[PDB]
Amino acid sequence: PEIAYPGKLICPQYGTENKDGEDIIFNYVPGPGTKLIQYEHNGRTLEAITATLVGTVRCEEEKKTDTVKNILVSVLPGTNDFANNLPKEGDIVLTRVTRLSLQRANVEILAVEDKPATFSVSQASSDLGETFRGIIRSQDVRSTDRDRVKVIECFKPGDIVRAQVLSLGDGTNYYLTTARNDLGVVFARAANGAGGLMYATDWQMMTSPVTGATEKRKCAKP
């Protein structure tokens, strides 16, 4: 698989070989960048893995602890883009708080996280509402005492909040959560950007070196 382009055939749905007097069955699974497409040829139909992206073809297989070998066929970019890595349920994202009212905290997705880090950045404009907007409900702010949560003491306008996707929600708002130790306000300035840089000293407290003023926030565990 030297090269990948949209529409190029990769492999059949199944494969096999002969090793040590035993036939090994390869079960190929359509991964990210590929798709099972049914073609016709010689009169008989055929389903084959087809690349849907432009890049280098990669495969992975795995058995975990919690004859047929399952192989995952995928296509990665060859050469940054927030296209192929659109925010899905379970993904962690970096978003900026746009507005606060008592009911909920609202942020617009700026970037997305990946497993061992690296980041994906949305090229959309925050000036034209081109960015995917999301909502952090008051009961999804933290894990303990979700009934009595003051939004004003958890987030502030302009704060950069690292959150995880709960659901796609509607077309307007994603639904996010920060009820983990590594989630919450990550980057912030005092007085909504009118002050100096604040770092997360305590998990619930933010401190600034020149300002001499401390503002409470639901910060990620340092």
């Binding site: 746009t98 507005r99 509402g129 306008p157 302009g158 007085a191 909504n192 950007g193 009118a194």
Partner: protein, 223 residues
């Protein structure tokens, strides 16, 4: 520099004014802070809605430039972080050009800056400092720098200038130059001679404005 202004002339607006220089008369109104449209909302700062209406005809792209330059002056003047997710409507209705509008927009812009500032003062909106704007022009045969030129002087000018300075400390310290809009043929020496004489007449204007503001507002307040 014999300008004349009135403050608080409109009833259904938070603040208003009427600035007059020569034949150039501009009336301005300011409402805010108020609830903003979703597309206007700024998470941390105040949103400015700036509108300029011409003396004749409807608003064109010309006034769109007047709105843009007026924005560059009013934006740093207002303490915007005091009003997050809020709106301030600023409308200027030019009543009389005082100049050939087909050729110049100098006097109308300066008068709009002074009027908008006065309207912001009347409305009681947080301002970081004070401000004054004057129109300046240069004549090729004369070689002179005329502050507050007439319409007839503009017709025979080689360059036209709008100068708006930011004043602090009782109108004695020039904090910054908010706007300098120089158009036409001019050299570096003319520019600084313009800025030197321009700063003087601007400082005189602030002093006059401070007088007008106190004369109108003080009767409203209590001792």
């Amino acid at each position: 520099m014999s300008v004349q202004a009135e403050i608080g002339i409109l009833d259904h607006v938070d603040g208003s004014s009427e600035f007059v220089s020569q034949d150039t008369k501009v009336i301005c109104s300011v409402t805010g802070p108020i609830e903003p449209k979703a597309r206007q909302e700024l998470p941390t700062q105040l949103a400015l809605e700036i509108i300029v209406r011409p003396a004749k005809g409807v608003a064109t792209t010309r006034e769109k430039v007047l709105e843009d330059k007026l924005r560059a002056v009013l934006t740093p003047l207002i303490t915007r972080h005091c009003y997050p997710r809020q709106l301030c409507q600023i409308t200027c209705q030019i009543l009389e050009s005082g100049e050939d509008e087909a050729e110049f927009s100098l006097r109308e812009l300066s008068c709009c800056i002074n009027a908008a500032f006065l309207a912001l003062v009347d409305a009681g909106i947080a301002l970081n400092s004070m401000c004054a704007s004057i129109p300046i022009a240069i004549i090729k045969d004369t070689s002179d720098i005329i502050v507050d030129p007439t319409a007839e002087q503009l017709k025979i000018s080689l360059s036209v200038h709008t100068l708006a300075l930011e004043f602090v400390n009782g109108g004695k310290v020039v904090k910054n130059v908010l706007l300098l809009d120089s158009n036409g043929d001019f050299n570096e020496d003319q520019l600084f001679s313009l800025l030197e004489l321009g700063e003087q007449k601007c400082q005189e204007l602030v002093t006059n404005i401070r007088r007008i503001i106190q004369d109108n507002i003080s009767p409203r307040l209590v001792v």
